[PDB]
Design a protein around this ligand. Structure first.
Ligand code: MTE
Ligand code: MTE
Ligand code: MO
Ligand code: MO
Lengths: 369, 359
């Protein structure tokens, strides 16, 4: 059992896979706090979790070569904090499966969580390694984790050089999560946090940072996490025909009430989350009780972030009167700062991996007598 | 097609709209809120001012000679493009545009960035600053057309904001802002202020009617008795968009093969990564061929023209639908009612075109 050393996890989590460990918090706990407690933050591991002795750990940065200890990472670079939501490419995959079977972890609406991350700015570490603030043409910063497949290939990913060097992009080499040291499942001792970008690129248990003229050659950068036409099937898919998912599109889901519930008549408070990639804020959330025919505007909770740096989700709520003995089909949809919107239905956005599941979330409940 | 004479507003015929990557100056859609100014070029001056910047008064000759000419091929799409689709759901207030309030040109001019830096403004300002524009066109009272963009976009080298005096290789036409306009790539046409008289750096958004009390998106539930422009942000970047230009609604096409064509575009420099095309009303899809050359990442200011040749069977009915996907994997929604708004702006639900196949 290569997973014999994996860490202990909270019992309240909805485990989608044990070995490797993948789990999401239940819907009723998911949006209870703006910052998702470390114990409930969703967990996505492709491989066994590395057991890292903090003292001997070294971060390799291949400059135009650094070997940074955890103590150096902490002391040499000013600590910055960024509150960012990580959403998995597979969040809401369960919706896709309802149309046609897909390949992937059966996530519901909880493959998304939010934390206040603390660490060194990737920008500062790269400038310290001797790299220039700017590089002409399309360059990339590649990441490798300490976790590896049977063949010894590590988990890896990349982001464009521009994003890595940009102060406003808030890309961190994080060693703290919600004020405490990074948990093992979340990348102890160091992970990359890439705000506004799909979770896949936020490499945990970071071993190496390199600059390259090309994207990471990792399996998960080249041959996974892309969107295709709904017509594409396993016999025709060609990962060269689409871009790696970086920024994600606008998203929202209803966390309260839950599907199949019978709610009391009178007033009903509907709640959920909304978020969009690339630091685009959520400017509105529309909520319907009649299956998307008529809408009401939800209250957006929380504090406004600077323009282009809305890395954290918006929690929303709406209290509405409901009549005894009626059926409700509760639907939410969000609008971001570029006026991007969510689509009505899943079949037209369907894909063989069930990624990029952003059609409206629909929750059916009945109202008691 | 002219939607209005006084003031003048017009769009090119759908049959020519997407026939050339660069829209000829004579066909490029025209949206004018006010009478078109008659600008005498020698006496014209562009005023540039603001806190911590030297006030400039630039002649057309100096704008051309002092600043290095930059060329940017950028698509301008009006907020009301495809308004007709909104009116079919419920009547709205606005020009009755069809799919042609969008056009593309190669613009040439001074970088707004260079002009502001020349005036002494810094590359970055803390807080949320804006760059305000005022046109020479004005209402009978005298308020000019105006707009603004965030200071960060104005100063970004990558954002390609121009003070353009050339359009597709020739002098800027009168209807398109002669002698000078702002071109704001990847942003709604409303902010590309024509007949530019002033550029001002300000800590606040432009107080213009068209910045404060127009060009915003609202929930479909909002009506005239409840609309409050303070509740929404000014449209700046636009969402992913596409439409079919060939064939045209109600066409009877010959059997055999059919070449479906159209355009696709997305705001904020996000490239179009795919266009899906259906012939059965959105039940099944095929992938269209994207025409033209790639642009650098984050600077896809120009539309992608697309086409798909498909076999069609005699005597059948088709419902042709297209939808586009951008670099952040944003998508177009299925239907118009849920994106409906009282001004019929931001019309990006799937375009559907019904045709029959002879015989
Ligand atoms: N090294 C390493 N990094 C990783 C992964 C991985 O398996 N190994 N999974 C990725 C995926 S696909 C996502 S969604 C996020 C999940 O971060 P979390 O488990 O801390 O929520 O981590 C990313 N980083
Ligand atoms: N001075 C001024 N500039 C303006 C206009 C206006 O009425 N006056 N209309 C705006 C609108 S709403 C749009 S859609 C574009 C259209 O530019 P075009 O006419 O060159 O296509 O110009 C913008 N610039
Ligand atoms: Mo993921
Ligand atoms: Mo417009």
């Amino acid at each position: 059992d290569p997973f014999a050393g994996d860490p202990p996890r909270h019992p309240g989590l909805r485990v989608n896979s044990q070995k490797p460990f993948n789990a999401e918090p239940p819907a009723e706990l998911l949006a209870e706090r703006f910052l998702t407690p470390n114990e409930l933050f969703f967990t996505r591991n492709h491989l066994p979790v590395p057991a890292v002795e903090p003292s001997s750990y070294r971060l390799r940065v291949d400059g135009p070569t650094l070997s940074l200890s955890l103590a150096e990472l902490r002391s040499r670079f000013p600590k910055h904090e960024v509150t960012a939501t990580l959403q998995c490419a597979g969040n809401r995959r369960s919706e896709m499966s309802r149309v046609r079977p897909v390949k992937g972890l059966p996530w519901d609406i909880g493959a998304i969580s939010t934390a206040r991350w603390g660490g060194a700015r990737l920008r500062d570490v790269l400038l310290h390694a001797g790299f220039p603030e700017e590089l002409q043409g399309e360059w990339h910063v590649c990441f490798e984790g300490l976790d590896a497949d049977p063949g010894g290939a590590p988990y890896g990913a990349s982001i464009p050089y521009g994003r890595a060097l940009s102060p406003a992009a808030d890309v961190l080499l994080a060693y703290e999560m919600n004020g405490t040291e990074l948990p093992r499942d979340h990348g102890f001792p160091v992970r990359v946090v890439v705000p506004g970008v799909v979770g896949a690129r936020s490499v945990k248990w970071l071993r190496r940072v390199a600059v390259s003229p090309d994207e990471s050659p990792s399996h998960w950068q080249q041959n996974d996490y892309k969107g295709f036409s709904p017509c594409v099937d396993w016999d025709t898919v060609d990962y060269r025909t689409a871009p790696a998912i970086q920024e994600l599109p606008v998203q929202s889901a209803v966390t309260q009430p839950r599907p199949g519930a019978a709610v009391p008549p009178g007033e009903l408070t509907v709640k959920g989350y909304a978020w969009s990639g690339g630091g685009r804020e959520v400017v509105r959330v529309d909520v319907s009780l009649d299956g998307g025919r008529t809408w009401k505007v939800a209250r957006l909770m929380g504090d406004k972030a600077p323009p282009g740096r809305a890395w954290a989700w918006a929690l929303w709520e709406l209290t509405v009167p409901v009549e005894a003995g009626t059926e409700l089909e509760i639907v939410c949809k969000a609008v971001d700062s570029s006026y991007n919107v969510q689509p009505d239905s899943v079949a037209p956005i369907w894909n063989l991996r069930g990624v990029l599941s952003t059609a409206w979330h629909r929750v059916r409940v009945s109202v008691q007598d």
